[PDB]
Amino acid sequence: VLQGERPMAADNKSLGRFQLTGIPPAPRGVPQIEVTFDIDANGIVHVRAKD
Amino acid sequence: VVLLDVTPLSLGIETMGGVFTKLIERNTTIPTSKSQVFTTAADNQTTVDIH
Amino acid sequence: MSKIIGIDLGTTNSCVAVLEGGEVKVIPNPEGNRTTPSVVAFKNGERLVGEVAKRQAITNPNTIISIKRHMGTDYKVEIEGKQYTPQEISAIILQYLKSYAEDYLGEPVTRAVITVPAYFNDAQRQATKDAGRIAGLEVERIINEPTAAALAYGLDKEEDQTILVYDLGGGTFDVSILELGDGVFEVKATAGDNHLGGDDFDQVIIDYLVNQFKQEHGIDLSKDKMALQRLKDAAEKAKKELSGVTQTQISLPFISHLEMTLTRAKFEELSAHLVERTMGPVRQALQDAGLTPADIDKVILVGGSTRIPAVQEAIKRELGKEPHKGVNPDEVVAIGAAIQGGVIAGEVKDVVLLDVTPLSLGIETMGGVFTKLIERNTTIPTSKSQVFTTAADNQTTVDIHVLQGERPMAADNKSLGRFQLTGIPPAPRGVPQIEVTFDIDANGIVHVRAKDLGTNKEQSITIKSSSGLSEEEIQRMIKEAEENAEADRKRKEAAELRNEAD
Amino acid sequence: VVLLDVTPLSLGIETMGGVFTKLIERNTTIPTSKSQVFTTAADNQTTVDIH
Amino acid sequence: LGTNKEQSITIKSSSGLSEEEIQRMIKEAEENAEADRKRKEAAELRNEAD
Amino acid sequence: ELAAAKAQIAELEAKLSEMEHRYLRLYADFENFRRRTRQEMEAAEKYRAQSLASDLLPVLDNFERAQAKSILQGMEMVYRSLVDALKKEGVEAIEAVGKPFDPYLPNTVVEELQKGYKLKDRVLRPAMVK
Amino acid sequence: AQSLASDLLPVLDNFERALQAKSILQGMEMVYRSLVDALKKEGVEAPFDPYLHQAVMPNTVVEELQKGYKLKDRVLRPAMVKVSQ
């Protein structure tokens, strides 16, 4: 997860990182993965990544 | 990871009497195709509207 | 409902059998025995029955041994705590046979049918239906042993005829001459011997054996019962061998040791004497009926010890022809009991035809590599379904080509169908699913479907002949697959998984 | 055309109430995974079968 | 979930019959599809009265 | 009612065809089971006594290997019915005897130390061989 | 597999009852001994009730005539014993 305006990873703020495992092995681009960002009235933001 | 076009919403037609039928369900995929069959809204219906 | 279960009691020969589907079935007992036998006991508060009752028999007060002799008689046994009757003892014979047919099937048989003697009449053959229902298992009729195995096989396709049975009991012999009433059985004649049979055979083996050992070492045999058991068993072996086999020996050694080369024609000249204790019962029948050995339409081999060529070399030169061996004679009464058991309460007239599939059917993989779904020999009213996927990324459409034969190759096989299917959604190879149900009816025109999943767009075909041709032409090919014996060299296209580029 | 494999029969768990509830619809694919949840039968269960 | 207790099995695909048995018991589902009657026990939500 | 009689008549004849069919597909499936099962139990009992057999290859190693001459004559039915009871099943020994002598199973077999144990298209334990 | 354990119990009880040339019976540490443990690694263990002591000819069983083994919860070939009546 990155926060900035800049089109390259390098140039942005790295807010946090996490991974997800177990997805069925199977061809590229085929599996769906849905990441949603949600921001509360505070400025705190949760991220969920779900097969 | 990379992102694939999803059909952010799911489409279909009205089915008689009357209701929403799903045809291409929601998060589906990049191009796809789907099909089904129903019949005359009445006794020898004059014509069939598809909304 | 319930299937009508056979139980025969042959006094040291006994079985409870059934019919599942289109094939006649001989049940197994609680003992490892293909059949456990007729005799029993009791003790305090707890019954003991069968092959488990019978060796507690030379060790305990209670053993009943072949009570066949008392069915239909005023016979009453004095036994501990109450005297007993043939009926109440047989109620337990079939109470145990009930729990055992139950602990085999799980689908209970209340309705059941029995195998009695052809000689019996209003007294004892009623005793059968009666004691049949004493244990609790009702009798829908009582067959007779002889008309029974006659209809285990069955005579009613055929025409008005005549016959003579062969019963071989456990140390009893019998034969009953019968006729066809064009749908009716009435047993005509009866004969046999009260003691003759298999155990006696074993004892001519044990006798000449023991006598020959006293002939060499001077040292006598029969005083010793693990030795004599050793005898009974090994001699039984040599017996049934002499039946099938052309030469024998017996390894009985570390005796106390006899190692002999067991002969056949010596066992035959050994046994060729009581084979005319039979010809007596047989021809006594031939007179009870009046019609000569030359008057009969069919005749048969029954019993346990009937498997040796002794009696059959006494017959081929007696009545002119060979017997119907199409059974496994040992249990042959049991199943017979239930044949009509299921001709009554159950199935009716049976074709059982086009029970086989011309060839292994499959279709066009990887440019012609042929994979089977349908095999050969397969009962025709059936269909099998399988789903392949994309040859290559973005297959916009897929053609279907199906083969019949065995040889895993394209024109090394018969081109059956070719038809195609389009509109598939564009996307990575292997992913999209296309189904083909080979749908094979009974009658021989085969339907076959392929349809995407995510589409639900579907193309199928209705073929026509599937054969159009003859037996020899096919079997010449069924031969042809064998004849080729590795054209399998096309594992060459099996390594054409080179197709994968990554 | 080709192989893979469809899991020719749809699998599931006896659900509570004594019903069948599919976790993997019939013709699916080379190995995949599904996950679902379900909960307490009746008040304060200590134990749960899976058939 | 919250107590993290992992007890679980593995099926050996052994007992399940796929020769015919499947291409049978599906058409069963077709013949008998009115099996939707099932909802009975759905209705048996009754004893969910605690 | 009037020809609704004929209507149900139809219904039932129809369920005649329909029924018999419902059956013959049955006859199909039933009789079909056999090929499969028969072969399944085939493969069941070719192997699986392999443990009994390569466990028993040491005790028939001394009953194939190891005044009292009568006591040695007795071993007749012992190693007679113990290479004999390896028979109806089919775990034989290794018979080549001075041949090419497949090395997983000039250059001729001179002698053989350990007696063979093999049951039905496989290899149990090899012989140490001359 | 119990099939090699029933039809092999005649030769096995044959060696089992047989337990200068005097020292050649010591070579029996292996052949009719080893078969015990090698036929006990498939699970073979050797009130008398239900034919259990097969009686050639109180209430207790006496000794063993020709013995026998359960396949571990099965029976293939029986066992000889004598009862004190």
* Residues linked to residue C65 through DSSP beta bridges, in sequence order: C39
Instruction: Name residues whose C-beta falls within 8 Å of residue C52's C-beta, 6 or more positions apart in sequence.
Output: C30, C31, C36, G50, G51
- In degrees, rounded to 5, the angle at the alpha carbon of residue F100 between the alpha carbons of residues F99 and F103 is 120
Rounded to the nearest 10 degrees, the angle between the axes of helix C332-339 and helix C145-153 is 80
Do at least 3 CB pairs under 8 Å connect E with C? yes
Alpha-carbon dihedral of residues C205, C207, C213, C218, nearest 10 degrees?
A: 180
C-beta separation of C191 from C34 below 8 A: no
Experimental technique of record: X-ray
Task: Name which of G29, C42, G64 is nearest C52 in CA terms.
Answer: C42
CATH topology of domain C1-157+330-352: Nucleotidyltransferase; domain 5 (3.30.420)
Residue to mutate among G24, G34, G74, with most F CBs inside 10 A, is G34
Closest Cα of chain D to A12: distance in Å? 35
Amino acid at position C299, single letter: V
The DSSP bridge pattern shows strands C47-49 and C64-65 to be unpaired
Which residues of C carry out catalysis?
A: 8, 68, 145, 167
CATH number for the segment(s) C158-196+272-329: 3.30.420.40
Q: Is C177 helix (H, G, I), strand (E, B) or coil?
A: strand
φ and ψ at G82, to 5 degrees? -125, 135
A31: closest CA of chain C, how far (Å): 11
- Residue C384: helix, strand or coil by DSSP? strand
F81/E contact by beta carbon, under 8 A: no
- Backbone Cα Rg of chain B: 15
Residue D22, amino acid: K
How distant, in Å, are the alpha carbons of D13, F107, F122 from that of F125?
A: 46, 21, 10
Q: Residue D6: list chain A partners with CB under 8 A.
A: none
Instruction: Check if E30 contacts F (Cβ < 8 Å).
Output: no
Distance in Å from the first CA to the final CA of chain B: 37
CA distances from G33 to C252, C263, G25 (A): 22, 35, 12
Task: List CB contacts of D11: < 8 A, sequence separation 6 or more.
Answer: D22, D23, D24
Residue A18: what residue type?
A: F
Q: Sign of torsion, CA C250 C254 C258 C260?
A: positive
| Cα C234 to chain centroid, rounded | 26
Q: Which amino acid is at C15?
A: C
Contact B24, B32 (CB under 8 A): yes
With contacts defined as CB-CB under 8 Å, which chain F residues touch E24? 29
Q: Tell me where in chain C the CATH 3.30.420.40 domain(s) lie.
A: 1-157+330-352, 158-196+272-329
Chains D and G in direct contact, meaning 3 or more beta-carbon pairs closer than 8 angstroms: no
Rounded Cα distance, C91 and E16, in Å:
41
Q: What is the resolution of this structure in A?
A: 4.1
On whether the C353-497 domain is CATH 2.60.34.10, my answer is yes
CA separation for the pair C350, C25 (Å, rounded): 18
Give kind and range of the element (H or E) at residue C147.
helix C145-153
Contact E7, D50 (CB under 8 A): no
User: Of the candidates F49, F52, F66, which has its C-beta nearest G30's C-beta?
Assistant: F66
Interface contact C383-E23, CB threshold 8 A: yes
The CATH 3.90.640.10 domain(s) of chain C lie at 197-271
> C253 vs F74: CB contact, 8 Å cut-off?
yes
Measured distance CA(G81)–CA(C221) in Å, rounded = 20
* Tokens, residue C344: 């009554």
For chain E, the residue count is 50
Residue of F46, F52, F70, F119 to mutate when probing chain G, most G C-beta within 10 A:
F52
| Strand blocks (E) in chain G | 54-55, 61-64, 80-83
Distance CA E7, CA D42 (A): 21
Residue for token digits 């009545």? C319
Name, in order, each residue with C-beta under 8 angstroms of C131's C-beta and a sequence gap of 6 or more.
C71, C86, C87, C90, C91, C94
The CATH superfamily holding the domain C197-271 is ATPase, substrate binding domain, subdomain 4 (3.90.640.10)
Chain F positions touching E19 (Cβ under 8 A) are: 33, 36
* Phi, psi (rounded to 5 degrees) for C79: -135, 160
**Are F77 and C380 an interchain contact pair (Cβ–Cβ within 8 Å)?**
no
Classify residue C154 as left (phi > 0), alpha (psi -120 to 50) or beta. Answer: left
Asked if A touches D (at least 3 Cβ pairs < 8 angstroms), the answer reads yes
Write the CB contacts of F108 (distance below 8 Å, at least 6 apart in sequence). F98, F99, F101
Q: Which of C101, C331, C32 has its CA nearest to residue G51?
A: C32
Give the dihedral sign, CA C367/C368/C374/C380: positive
C383·E20 Cβ contact <8 A: no
Strands (DSSP E) contained in C199-317 are 250-251, 259-260
Contact F129, F102 (CB under 8 A): no
> How many other CB atoms are there within 10 angstroms of residue G68's CB atom?
21
The four Cα atoms G59, G65, G70, G71 give a dihedral, to 10 degrees, of -170
* Nearest of C449, C434, C483, C441 to residue C466 by alpha carbon: C441
Burial C462-488 (b: 16+ CB within 10 A, else e): eeeebeeeeeeebeebeeebeeeeeee
Write the single-letter amino acid at D32: T
